[PDB]
């Protein structure tokens, strides 16, 4: 959670962070890819039969 890591509970920091929203969407896109790939790894190794 970008806003919680960078800004915590600060509202001013969040309003300032609204400039960098594409970068956080990008970070979470990459992490989501990694996560579904972990599940696909386990599938391709164990669910052959």
């Amino acid at each position: 959670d970008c806003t919680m890591y960078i800004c915590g509970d600060s509202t001013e920091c969040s309003n300032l962070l609204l400039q960098y929203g594409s970068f956080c969407t990008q970070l979470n896109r990459a992490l989501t890819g990694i996560a579904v790939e972990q599940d696909k790894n386990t599938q391709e190794v164990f669910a052959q039969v």
Partner: protein
């Protein structure tokens, strides 16, 4: 790990609480360990018989 478990100085002491309070989550895998064990037992029963 529930909020009432991280409530107090256990937040600073525990590492997972410190991660969760800063927005860092660990997502559970889709296949449980029992399911992976069923897959391996199926592979063993297929290769044995």
């Amino acid at each position: 790990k529930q909020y009432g478990d991280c409530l107090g100085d256990i937040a600073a002491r525990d590492l997972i609480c410190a991660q969760k309070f800063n927005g860092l989550t660990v997502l559970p895998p889709l296949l449980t360990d029992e399911m992976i064990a069923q897959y391996t037992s199926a592979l063993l029963a297929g290769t044995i018989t």
